[PDB]
Amino acid sequence: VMDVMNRLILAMDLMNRDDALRVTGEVREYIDTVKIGYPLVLSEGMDIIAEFRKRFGCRIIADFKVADIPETNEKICRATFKAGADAIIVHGFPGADSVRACLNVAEEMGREVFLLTEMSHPGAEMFIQGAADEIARMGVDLGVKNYVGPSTRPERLSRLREIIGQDSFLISPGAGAQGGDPGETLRFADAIIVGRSIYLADNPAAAAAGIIESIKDL
Amino acid sequence: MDVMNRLILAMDLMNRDDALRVTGEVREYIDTVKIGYPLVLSEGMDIIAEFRKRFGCRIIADFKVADIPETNEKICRATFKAGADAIIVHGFPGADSVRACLNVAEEMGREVFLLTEMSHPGAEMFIQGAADEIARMGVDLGVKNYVGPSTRPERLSRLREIIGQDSFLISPGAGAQGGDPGETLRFADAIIVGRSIYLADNPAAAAAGIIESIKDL
Numbered sequence: 001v002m003d004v005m006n007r008l009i010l011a012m013d014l015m016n017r018d019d020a021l022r023v024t025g026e027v028r029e030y031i032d033t034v035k036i037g038y039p040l041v042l043s044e045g046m047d048i049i050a051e052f053r054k055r056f057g058c059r060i061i062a063d064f065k066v067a068d069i070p071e072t073n074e075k076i077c078r079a080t081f082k083a084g085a086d087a088i089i090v091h092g093f094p095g096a097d098s099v100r101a102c103l104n105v106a107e108e109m110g111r112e113v114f115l116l117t118e119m120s121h122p123g124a125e126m127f128i129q130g131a132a133d134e135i136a137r138m139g140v141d142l143g144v145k146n147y148v149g150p151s152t153r154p155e156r157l158s159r160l161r162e163i164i165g166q167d168s169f170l171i172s173p174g175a176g177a178q179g180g181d182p183g184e185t186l187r188f189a190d191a192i193i194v195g196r197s198i199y200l201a202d203n204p205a206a207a208a209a210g211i212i213e214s215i216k217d218l
Numbered sequence: 219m220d221v222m223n224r225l226i227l228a229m230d231l232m233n234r235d236d237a238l239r240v241t242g243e244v245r246e247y248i249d250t251v252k253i254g255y256p257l258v259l260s261e262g263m264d265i266i267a268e269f270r271k272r273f274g275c276r277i278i279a280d281f282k283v284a285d286i287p288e289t290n291e292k293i294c295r296a297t298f299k300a301g302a303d304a305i306i307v308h309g310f311p312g313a314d315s316v317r318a319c320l321n322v323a324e325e326m327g328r329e330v331f332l333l334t335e336m337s338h339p340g341a342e343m344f345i346q347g348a349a350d351e352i353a354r355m356g357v358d359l360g361v362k363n364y365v366g367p368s369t370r371p372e373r374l375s376r377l378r379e380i381i382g383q384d385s386f387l388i389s390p391g392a393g394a395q396g397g398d399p400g401e402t403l404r405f406a407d408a409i410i411v412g413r414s415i416y417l418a419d420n421p422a423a424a425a426a427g428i429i430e431s432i433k434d435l
C-alpha cells in the first residue's frame with residue numbers, strides 16, 4: 001500500500017492556483033500525499049496535477065467520485081491517469097460494471113482505484129448508508145484494495161474495516177471541519193483526509209503539525 | 219427548456235478538433251449539447267465557452283455531481299463560471315447535497331438536472347431500488363429537471379408519473395445502449411444521444427436519420 005507520511009492526506013480544495021500552491025507548499029514537510037478534487041481541477045485545469053508533481057514530492061489522488069456508466073467511466077479514468085494522477089476515487093453506488101470499468105483502466109495503466117463506500121455528510125444516511133456494506137463487499141469481490149469511509153461515523157468506519165479486512169487500504173474524510181476525531185478515526189483508517197481544518201487556518205503548517213502531534217503515538 | 223428536435227448531443231469525443239468538427243456537422247439539427255468529463259478533462263473547461271461562441275448552443279454540464287454539500291457548491295460555482303447553462307447532479311448522495319447545487323444554480327441563473335435512475339446494467343444493483351424515492355425527494359426539493367433511462371421505458375414512465383407533466387425530463391441510453399428514440403419520447407421531453415451520432419461514419423446523416431424516425435413527435 002502507498003506509504004502516506006504521517007497518515008495525513010491533504011484535501012486541497014482551494015480554487016485559486018496561487019493559494020492552493022502556497023498552502024500545499026507550507027505543509028509539504030508534513031504531508032507527501034495530496035487529494036486533488038474537482039473544486040481545484042475545474043478551476044485551474046488538469047495541468048494542476050502536473051504543477052503539483054513538479055513543485056512538490058507528493059503522490060496525487062484524484063478525487064473525482066467517478067459515477068457514470070462503464071463507457072464514460074473508462075474515459076474519465078484514462079484522462080485522469082494520463083494527466084499524472086497516481087490514483088482515482090470511484091463511487092460504488094452505480095454498480096459493479098461501473099467499478100470494473102475503472103479497475104480495468106487502472107490495471108492497464110498501472111495506477112490505483114479507491115472505492116468510496118459510505119460518505120461522511122448527513123445526506124449519506126438517506127440512500128448510501130443502507131447500501132454501504134454491500135458496496136464494500138462488492139469491492140472485495142471485485143478485487144478492490146483501496147477504500148474510502150467516513151470519519152464522522154466511527155461505528156460505520158469500523159464495520160467497513162471489518163468487511164474489507166486488515167490488508168486493504170482505507171482512507172477517511174470528515175475529521176476536523178465535519179466533526180470527526182483524528183485519533184478515533186485512525187483506529188480503523190490507515191490515513192485521514194483533512195481539508196478545511198488545514199487550508200483555512202491562519203497557519204496551515206501549524207494546523208497540520210497540531211493534528212500530527214495529537215496522533216503522534218499512532 | 220426548449221430543445222430543438224427533442225435531441226441533445228452527448229459530445230463525449232476527447233479531442234477538441236473532432237468534438238468541434240462533429241458538433242459543427244450536426245449543428246443544424248440541435249441547439250443543446252451535453253458536455254461531460256471525457257471532453258472537459260481532456261481539453262479544459264474553456265471548451266464550454268468555445269462551444270457557445272461557435273454554436274451559441276445551450277450547454278448542459280454532465281458532471282454527475284456526487285460529493286458532500288460544501289464540495290458540491292464549489293463544483294457548481296466553477297462549472298457555471300465556465301458558462302454552463304445547467305448541471306447534472308446525482309440524487310443518491312442525499313437531499314443536502316442536491317440542495318447545495320440548487321442554491322448555486324439559483325444564484326447564477328442556471329438549472330439543476332436530477333439524475334434519478336441510470337441506464338446501464340449496474341444501475342439495477344443500488345440505484346434502481348432508490349430511484350422512486352430519489353424522484354420524490356426531487357419533487358419535495360422543488361427540482362424541475364430530471365434524467366431517467368431510455369433503456370428501461372417502464373422505469374422512465376414511472377419517473378414521469380412521479381414528477382408530473384410539468385417537469386422537464388431528458389433521457390440517455392437511446393441508440394448505442396439499446397434504447398429506442400421514439401419509445402423514449404413517449405415519456406421524456408428530449409433524448410440524449412452520443413455514440414450513435416459522434417461515432418457514425420456520417421454524424422450528420424445519423425442525426426438526420428434519428429430525427430426522421432421521430433418526425434411525428
Ligand SMILES: O=C1CC(=O)N([C@@H]2O[C@H](COP(=O)(O)O)[C@@H](O)[C@H]2O)C(=O)N1
Pocket residue numbers: 011013037063116118119120121148149150173174175176177178193194195196197285286289
Ligand atoms: O464521504 C466523503 C468523501 C469525500 O471524498 N469527502 C471529501 O473530503 C474532503 C473533506 O474536506 P474537509 O476536511 O471537510 O474540509 C473534501 O474534499 C470532500 O469532497 C468528504 O468530505 N466526504
Ligand SMILES: O=C1CC(=O)N([C@@H]2O[C@H](COP(=O)(O)O)[C@@H](O)[C@H]2O)C(=O)N1
Pocket residue numbers: 068069072228230254280333335336337338365366367390391392393394395410411412413414
Ligand atoms: O444513466 C445515465 C446518465 C447519463 O448521463 N448517461 C450519459 O449519457 C451519454 C450516453 O451516450 P451514448 O448515446 O450511450 O453514447 C453519456 O455521456 C453518458 O455518460 C448515460 O449514458 N446514462
